[PDB]
Design an enzyme around this catalytic site. Sequence first.
Site, PDB file in Angstrom:
ATOM      1  N   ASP A   1      -6.976 -54.872 -39.669  1.00  0.00           N
ATOM      2  CA  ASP A   1      -7.443 -53.490 -39.750  1.00  0.00           C
ATOM      3  C   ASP A   1      -6.456 -52.475 -39.165  1.00  0.00           C
ATOM      4  O   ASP A   1      -6.354 -52.312 -37.947  1.00  0.00           O
ATOM      5  CB  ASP A   1      -8.795 -53.358 -39.075  1.00  0.00           C
ATOM      6  CG  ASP A   1      -9.343 -51.982 -39.189  1.00  0.00           C
ATOM      7  OD1 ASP A   1      -8.792 -51.179 -40.000  1.00  0.00           O
ATOM      8  OD2 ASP A   1     -10.333 -51.693 -38.479  1.00  0.00           O
ATOM      9  N   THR A   2      -5.714 -51.823 -40.052  1.00  0.00           N
ATOM     10  CA  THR A   2      -4.724 -50.839 -39.631  1.00  0.00           C
ATOM     11  C   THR A   2      -5.359 -49.600 -39.043  1.00  0.00           C
ATOM     12  O   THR A   2      -4.677 -48.848 -38.341  1.00  0.00           O
ATOM     13  CB  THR A   2      -3.854 -50.447 -40.803  1.00  0.00           C
ATOM     14  OG1 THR A   2      -4.673 -49.934 -41.864  1.00  0.00           O
ATOM     15  CG2 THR A   2      -3.121 -51.604 -41.284  1.00  0.00           C
ATOM     16  N   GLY A   3      -6.646 -49.380 -39.283  1.00  0.00           N
ATOM     17  CA  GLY A   3      -7.403 -48.271 -38.765  1.00  0.00           C
ATOM     18  C   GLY A   3      -8.000 -48.493 -37.385  1.00  0.00           C
ATOM     19  O   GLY A   3      -8.645 -47.598 -36.833  1.00  0.00           O
TER      20      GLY A   3
HETATM   21  C1  LIG Z   1      -9.837 -45.761 -31.940  1.00  0.00           C
HETATM   22  O1  LIG Z   1     -11.024 -46.128 -32.551  1.00  0.00           O
HETATM   23  C2  LIG Z   1     -10.918 -47.345 -33.240  1.00  0.00           C
HETATM   24  O2  LIG Z   1      -9.863 -47.934 -33.366  1.00  0.00           O
HETATM   25  N1  LIG Z   1     -12.158 -47.857 -33.818  1.00  0.00           N
HETATM   26  C3  LIG Z   1     -12.212 -49.058 -34.572  1.00  0.00           C
HETATM   27  C4  LIG Z   1     -13.085 -50.060 -33.825  1.00  0.00           C
HETATM   28  C5  LIG Z   1     -12.867 -48.673 -35.925  1.00  0.00           C
HETATM   29  O3  LIG Z   1     -14.047 -48.541 -36.023  1.00  0.00           O
HETATM   30  N2  LIG Z   1     -11.976 -48.448 -37.044  1.00  0.00           N
HETATM   31  C6  LIG Z   1     -12.484 -48.067 -38.393  1.00  0.00           C
HETATM   32  C7  LIG Z   1     -11.793 -46.795 -38.802  1.00  0.00           C
HETATM   33  C8  LIG Z   1     -12.102 -45.735 -37.708  1.00  0.00           C
HETATM   34  C9  LIG Z   1     -13.479 -45.089 -37.645  1.00  0.00           C
HETATM   35  C10 LIG Z   1     -13.738 -44.085 -36.535  1.00  0.00           C
HETATM   36  C11 LIG Z   1     -12.656 -43.704 -35.526  1.00  0.00           C
HETATM   37  C12 LIG Z   1     -11.281 -44.343 -35.606  1.00  0.00           C
HETATM   38  C13 LIG Z   1     -11.019 -45.364 -36.704  1.00  0.00           C
HETATM   39  C14 LIG Z   1     -12.095 -49.141 -39.409  1.00  0.00           C
HETATM   40  O4  LIG Z   1     -10.718 -49.313 -39.305  1.00  0.00           O
HETATM   41  C15 LIG Z   1     -12.748 -50.458 -39.082  1.00  0.00           C
HETATM   42  C16 LIG Z   1     -14.219 -50.495 -39.499  1.00  0.00           C
HETATM   43  C17 LIG Z   1     -14.534 -51.982 -39.354  1.00  0.00           C
HETATM   44  C18 LIG Z   1     -15.948 -52.311 -39.879  1.00  0.00           C
HETATM   45  C19 LIG Z   1     -16.104 -53.049 -41.188  1.00  0.00           C
HETATM   46  C20 LIG Z   1     -17.493 -53.361 -41.694  1.00  0.00           C
HETATM   47  C21 LIG Z   1     -18.709 -52.946 -40.892  1.00  0.00           C
HETATM   48  C22 LIG Z   1     -18.538 -52.218 -39.572  1.00  0.00           C
HETATM   49  C23 LIG Z   1     -17.162 -51.899 -39.038  1.00  0.00           C
HETATM   50  N3  LIG Z   1     -14.359 -50.043 -40.839  1.00  0.00           N
HETATM   51  C24 LIG Z   1     -15.245 -48.964 -41.138  1.00  0.00           C
HETATM   52  O5  LIG Z   1     -15.830 -48.317 -40.312  1.00  0.00           O
HETATM   53  O6  LIG Z   1     -15.383 -48.762 -42.537  1.00  0.00           O
HETATM   54  C25 LIG Z   1     -16.516 -48.048 -43.030  1.00  0.00           C
HETATM   55  C26 LIG Z   1     -15.851 -47.106 -44.218  1.00  0.00           C
HETATM   56  O7  LIG Z   1     -15.703 -48.001 -45.237  1.00  0.00           O
HETATM   57  C27 LIG Z   1     -16.837 -49.038 -45.100  1.00  0.00           C
HETATM   58  O8  LIG Z   1     -16.339 -50.219 -45.203  1.00  0.00           O
HETATM   59  C28 LIG Z   1     -16.706 -51.002 -43.831  1.00  0.00           C
HETATM   60  C29 LIG Z   1     -17.519 -50.223 -43.102  1.00  0.00           C
HETATM   61  C30 LIG Z   1     -17.391 -48.813 -43.623  1.00  0.00           C
END
Ligand SMILES: COC(=O)N[C@@H](C)C(=O)N[C@@H](Cc1ccccc1)[C@@H](O)C[C@H](Cc1ccccc1)NC(=O)O[C@H]1CO[C@H]2OCC[C@H]21
EC number: 3.4.23.16
Lengths: 99, 99
Positions: free
Chosen positions: B25-27
Amino acid sequence: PQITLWKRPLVTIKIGGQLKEALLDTGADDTVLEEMNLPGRWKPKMIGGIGGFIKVRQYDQILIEICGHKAIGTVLVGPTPVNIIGRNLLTQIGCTLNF
Amino acid sequence: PQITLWKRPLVTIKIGGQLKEALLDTGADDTVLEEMNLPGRWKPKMIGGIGGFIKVRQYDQILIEICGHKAIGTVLVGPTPVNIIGRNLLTQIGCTLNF
Ligand SMILES: COC(=O)N[C@@H](C)C(=O)N[C@@H](Cc1ccccc1)[C@@H](O)C[C@H](Cc1ccccc1)NC(=O)O[C@H]1CO[C@H]2OCC[C@H]21
């Protein structure tokens, strides 16, 4: 280009004719942007993440330019903490992870 | 290897002697794993995503093997819905985004 991950992978995007900064996020299925005025029809939707669910506006077939690469697809608009480009559009611009 | 983004980028990781599936997860700034009993000292932390914050346990200098590439860093443990490998460890395995 090739983007390393020492810093957040923030890029400039153009959407509805406006420039914004967004995070390239392989962990997101979907693209979610902060509240903004986008033209066209939209549908209420909910999307879930690490901390729970939020309410968003789903816009279909939206043009978005990501570092000069064009994508046309679904954009969710709502109270996300950061603008996120998810896999639905990363695939359109040919993005892969490599190590 | 090269990982496309048509599906969630799930890989096998080895941590604390156990094999698990995790999302590259690059995010994510940080690595967050589902509840597991890791030995040693830890510090309380809160981590935020879409929808709010969750409470986690921060463990330092944890070894994780990601598709055969070793990384050592901070791992957060808590009630996440999915195991997430974040930039703090992706940089160590030489992972880049390419388009
Ligand atoms: C500094 O803060 C951080 O680093 N925070 C990290 C922990 C963090 O949450 N990062 C997210 C991006 C992000 C959001 C808010 C603030 C900073 C960055 C994504 O990289 C990872 C999540 C993972 C996930 C996948 C499945 C179910 C629950 C969670 N993905 C996600 O929320 O995706 C949404 C949009 O698309 C959908 O698909 C999956 C779920 C839905």
